[PDB]
Amino acid sequence: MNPPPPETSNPNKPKRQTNQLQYLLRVVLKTLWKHQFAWPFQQPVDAVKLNLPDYYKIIKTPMDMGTIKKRLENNYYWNAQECIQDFNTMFTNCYIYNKPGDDIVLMAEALEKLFLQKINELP
């Protein structure tokens, strides 16, 4: 079974649209989104489709770029650090569940290097 996806809307939450959060959506996420290796990370891991019933027994804080994109489009975050933390959870989950040298890890490593290049300087 797949768990419910992470929440992307929360009215009880203080929201903000800072210059950096706009940049994280308009330039950072949407550059990463078009990368040739982005597709595994554009939605939650479908453990049912992959027949990996073990994935959510190991990864207890799932995150993906589809969730992040929705959060940004809902002004879910208070600051850019919260959004950057979600990206880093996504990469770290991949490094936890898989092993160095695995194909999915090469993909995440390529995406993470681009991510770090783009957030090195924020508005």
Ligand X SMILES: Cc1ccc(N(C)C(=O)c2ccc3c(c2)N(C2CC2)[C@H](C)C(=O)N3C)cc1
Q: Which is nearer to ligand X, 53 or 123 (CB)?
A: 53
The answer to whether 55 contacts ligand X (rule: CB under 6 A) is yes
CB 105, min distance to ligand X, A: 8
Binding residue for ligand X, selected from 50, 54, 58, 82, defined by CB under 6 A: 50
The answer to whether 54 contacts ligand X (rule: CB under 6 A) is no
Contact status, residue 41 vs residue 111, Cβ threshold 8 Å: yes
Residue list 93-122, contact with ligand X (CB under 6 A): 94, 97-98, 103-104
The answer to whether 38 contacts ligand X (rule: CB under 6 A) is no
Whole-angstrom CA distances from 55 to 16, 22, 38 are 33, 32, 19
Q: Which region among 3-11, 48-56, 77-85, 113-121 touches ligand X (by CB under 6 A)?
A: 48-56
What's the CA gap between 119 and 23, in Å, rounded?
9
The separation between the first and the last C-alpha atoms of the chain, rounded to the nearest angstrom, is 41
Contact status, residue 47 vs residue 56, Cβ threshold 8 Å: yes
CB 48, min distance to ligand X, A: 11
> What are the structure tokens assigned to 62, written together?
């799932």
